[PDB]
From Swiss-Prot, chains A, B, C:
ATP binds at R109, R110, A111, E112, R113, S114, N135. One of its GO terms (biological process) is porphyrin-containing compound biosynthetic process. GO terms for molecular function: ATP binding; corrinoid adenosyltransferase activity. Belongs to the Cob(I)alamin adenosyltransferase family. One of its GO terms (cellular component) is cytoplasm. Keywords: ATP-binding, Cobalamin biosynthesis, Cytoplasm, Nucleotide-binding, Porphyrin biosynthesis, Transferase. It is found in: Cytoplasm. This is Corrinoid adenosyltransferase. Pathway: Cofactor biosynthesis; adenosylcobalamin biosynthesis; adenosylcobalamin from cob(II)yrinate a,c-diamide: step 2/7. It catalyses: 2 cob(II)yrinate a,c diamide + reduced [electron-transfer flavoprotein] + 2 ATP = 2 adenosylcob(III)yrinate a,c-diamide + 2 triphosphate + oxidized [electron-transfer flavoprotein] + 3 H(+); 2 cob(II)alamin + reduced [electron-transfer flavoprotein] + 2 ATP = 2 adenosylcob(III)alamin + 2 triphosphate + oxidized [electron-transfer flavoprotein] + 3 H(+). The keyword RNA-binding does not apply. Its EC number is 2.5.1.17.
């Protein structure tokens, strides 16, 4: 019901999709560490979205900070650097890992929408950072999906 | 936010669920080709839903056409022909492939709802064909799930 | 569109997520029987949510009864009894089975929200029992996820 409650739950659903990718996609050590850090960040995003903003909090805030987003942006550029240009649009799938990352990607985008909806409902009580974080995360998951498809992505083909 | 944006995103989520079925369900060659064609059609459905209808477009339209739907309807009848009558209601699951197709099936039905919602919000700017396509696709995925369960489906049992 | 239709469909999506857990998580005999019973209950929950309540029905009702909920509550206590105290918050994932149960858990919570929304839209024509059932089911799936992670859960870690 509550816009904050919905956004929080969607973050949890996106987080579980990353857990499935890690558990069923068998990523290498490097990718594993990146994904595990993201699971930790998504918990933070959920806590942030669920907690209304208060003036001069006396408790340690658990909020997504700009540095979280700067970090995803850095990983995006670092990982995308070693990839060839796309010849056609990518269809979701390929290796078990790429397929599972595409699933997480789409769930993350659904979570981004509710995070923005939370902001719309409480412009003064909800931070826009969780939404921006999820916005950058889906782009990173797209890149990682490509990284996880060594032999090329599944491509769309014009009807005729 | 936008009804078109939501419908588009749900199609992408359904498309990723089909990608997982293909990647983790190890379907045979025949089923693979059918599912790959559907992934291509779902991209088209997304492009259609996201693009508002314009009079006398000067660009090649990327729209779901009736022929897409006629094709799914044909596959439905062709595949359902070799199946026995249901003794009870089917519970989602069984083989890895059938279970993964049931997951995609339910996501497709969620996408169908937003496609219809897009039509409701813009009766003159959104085509009903994407929604009809998704409507027929969930029925086909139900049939394929049965096809992928050679030893029988998981059946519901009256409480007592 | 219809609040009952949406709630019904979400129950079906949650049911398919349990089917994936069973099909890809390879649970032992005990867990299998519990999950299979839940799939049967979720069918009932869907039928209940989809069928508006009528006075003096002449047909056998297919409704979630309090006994369904009492049963989940009993399993929750029985399974949680053999588990150690949590040292930190749990991140969704771990073993294939635990990861798949966390995915189902989050879908069940999404279904709970629409079941409550159905009640809100038709306070006199929709039972609150399906919603209560889903409320208890996500807590049980959390417990089972822990049970399925013999070597410990994936834990959240404070930023610094």
């Amino acid at each position: 019901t509550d816009a904050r409650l919905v956004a929080y739950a969607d973050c949890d659903e996106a987080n579980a999709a990353i857990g499935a990718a890690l558990a069923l996609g068998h990523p290498d050590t490097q990718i594993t560490d990146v994904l595990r850090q993201i699971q930790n960040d998504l918990f933070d995003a959920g806590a942030d979205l669920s907690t209304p903003i208060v003036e001069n909090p006396k408790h340690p805030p658990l909020r997504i900070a700009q540095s979280y987003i700067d970090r995803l942006e850095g990983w995006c550029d670092a990982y995308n650097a070693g990839l060839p240009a796309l010849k056609s649009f990518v269809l979701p799938g390929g290796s078990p890992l790429s397929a599972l990352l595409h699933v997480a990607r789409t769930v993350v985008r659904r979570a981004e929408r509710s995070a923005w909806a939370a902001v719309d409902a409480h412009p003064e009580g909800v931070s826009v950072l969780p939404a921006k974080y999820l916005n950058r995360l889906s782009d990173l998951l797209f890149i990682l999906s490509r990284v996880a498809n060594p032999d090329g992505d599944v491509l769309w083909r014009p009807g005729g």
